[PDB]
Ligand binder design. Structure first.
Ligand SMILES: [Zn+2]
Length: 170
């Protein structure tokens, strides 16, 4: 299990560098991230969140651990002005959920774990989740779209949950 960085570790603010080639290390690392992500549990994780500042995103929206998905050097374009609200979470802001307003349909341009490009169009949960993980790659957290009260309540409450994750190891 890779340790997940926790708000407000300033390392979450690092802008990810692009993957140069998909090496066997990038493959192992991506498998490390699926396991971390599935253990939390959670549906999405950026390499930024396990302190590896490269454009690698791991995802699985399925009610099982059965529909894994990889985005390396992603580019996401909104396809419209329409935004949909969604109640977002984050393994790097553990416990806390609020409603964020993001574009509803987006185009995803990325590379897979075999080094092949793909272009997909996304709505619903998928459009929410890549935009959230993209932000991680640009050092942005879903807490940046909430008010500073909501933010500071998250700061103090994550320190609380983190110290307790440690006291459970004891
Ligand atoms: Zn997140």
């Amino acid at each position: 299990l890779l340790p997940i960085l926790s708000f407000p570790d300033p390392r979450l603010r690092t802008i990810a560098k692009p993957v140069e080639e998909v090496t066997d290390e990038i493959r192992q690392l991506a498998a490390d991230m699926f396991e971390t992500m599935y253990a939390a549990p959670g549906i999405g994780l950026a390499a930024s969140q396990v302190d590896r500042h490269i454009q690698l995103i791991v995802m699985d929206l399925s009610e099982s651990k059965d529909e894994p998905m990889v985005f390396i050097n992603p580019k996401v374009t909104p396809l419209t002005e329409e935004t949909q609200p969604y109640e977002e979470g984050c393994l790097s802001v553990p416990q806390i959920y609020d409603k964020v307003d993001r574009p509803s349909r987006v185009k995803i341009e990325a590379i897979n774990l075999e080094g092949q490009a793909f272009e997909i169009e996304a709505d619903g949960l998928l459009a929410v989740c890549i935009q959230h993980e993209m932000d991680h790659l640009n050092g942005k957290l879903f807490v940046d779209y909430l008010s500073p009260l909501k933010r500071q309540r998250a700061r103090e409450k994550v320190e609380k949950i983190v110290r307790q994750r440690e006291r459970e190891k004891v």
